[PDB]
Design a protein around this ligand. Structure first.
Ligand SMILES: [Zn+2]
Lengths: 278, 95
């Protein structure tokens, strides 16, 4: 009846086992399970993610052991929070992380167990640092083809997620499926130390530790002189003369600005004499 | 701005709908009959010259640019005591 676009709140702790357990299955595809709480129709949260045994014979719906979860939920009771299960996830490192033929067969089984059972995919390969990558989807019922086939209200959270549209075969699965919005509920307490732990460990280890003399400048002078004539022949090549040769051509970069910063490296590193000492 | 978070926010655009007009009513409940000239063509009045005819309070439309070109009627029994420059309801004195 009434269906509203869902918003997925992921915890920074749940983001860990998505890429981490997925990295352990690389190259092969894994099968996980999502753990969280259903607040309402238009929003959903995943508060935890745990690792499930990887299948070396290929992913199947029987790869999830029911006594593995029954022993896990009991261990979650003695753990701080015993929250009910919600849905499943699987890695797909070998390709662009789209729902395979097994993923649709385990859909109607998991959506019978739990109401939503959001399908979540993840890939390591698409980037390293500055991209969300991952993936998510939710099955829209094929029996609804008799009814209105274009959910959801509050559109562009889908529509904008429908950008880039990610080639063809991916959105070729937009038949019988619709993706879901992933935003981050603020962990910033942990996220503030995530930046502090990362940059401090990357700043000279104490900031002190790190803080071929003339010879490095004799090797640099070959880049600061012998590179000049191959750079300064181009203005004489800009002289035609004049003018039979196709123009414009700009040879100014990148050596000029590199030798600039090359002195910026050597000047402030030589200031270590004046800085460290006295 | 963003109704894509919640669709009622698109139906909350209903707040942008507000009435505005100008009125030539003289005073109280009595409705005077006054017609004065306007130098703008009906092309502005079309909703897909020598002189125009404006109410005579129901009032008649005017564009903010047409307020300067209109002149109070000198032959009418009802003439405004206040100089007519911009729109809005203004007083109209009976001679
Ligand atoms: Zn699979």
């Amino acid at each position: 009846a009434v269906d509203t676009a869902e918003q997925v709140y992921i915890s920074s702790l749940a983001l860990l086992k998505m890429l981490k357990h997925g990295r352990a299955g690389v190259p092969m595809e894994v099968m996980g399970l999502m753990l969280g709480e259903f607040v309402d129709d238009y929003t959903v949260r995943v508060i935890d993610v745990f690792a499930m045994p990887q299948s070396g014979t290929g992913v199947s719906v029987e790869a999830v052991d029911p006594v593995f979860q029954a022993k896990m939920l009991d261990m979650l009771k003695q753990t701080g929070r015993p929250e009910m299960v919600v849905g499943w996830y699987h890695s797909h490192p070998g390709f662009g992380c789209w729902l395979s033929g097994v993923d649709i067969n385990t859909q109607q089984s998991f959506e019978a167990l739990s109401e939503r059972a959001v399908a979540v995919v993840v890939d390591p390969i698409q980037s390293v640092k500055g991209k969300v990558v991952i993936d998510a989807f939710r099955l829209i019922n094929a029996n609804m083809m008799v009814l209105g086939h274009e959910p959801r209200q509050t559109t562009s959270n889908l529509g904008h997620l429908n950008k880039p549209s990610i080639q063809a075969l991916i959105h070729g699965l937009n038949r019988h499926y619709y993706s879901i919005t992933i935003n981050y509920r603020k962990n910033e307490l942990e996220q503030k130390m995530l930046l502090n732990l990362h940059k401090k460990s990357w700043m000279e280890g104490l900031t002190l530790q790190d803080y071929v003399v003339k010879e490095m400048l004799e090797l640099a002078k070959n880049y600061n002189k012998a590179v000049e004539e191959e750079d300064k022949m181009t203005p004489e090549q800009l002289a035609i003369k004049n003018v039979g040769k196709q123009d414009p051509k700009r040879h100014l970069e990148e050596h000029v600005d590199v030798l600039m910063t090359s002195n910026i490296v050597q000047c402030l590193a030589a200031m270590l004499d004046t800085v460290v000492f006295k | 701005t963003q109704f894509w978070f919640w669709f009622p926010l698109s139906h909350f655009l209903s707040l942008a709908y507000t009435p505005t007009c100008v009125i030539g009513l003289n005073k109280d409940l009595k409705m005077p009959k006054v017609q004065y000239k306007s130098n703008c063509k009906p092309s502005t009045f079309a909703y897909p010259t020598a002189k125009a005819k404006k109410k005579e309070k129901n009032p008649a439309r005017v564009m903010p640019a047409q307020l300067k070109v209109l002149t109070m009627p000198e032959t009418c029994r009802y003439q405004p005591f206040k100089p007519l420059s911009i729109g809005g309801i203004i007083i109209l004195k009976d001679t």
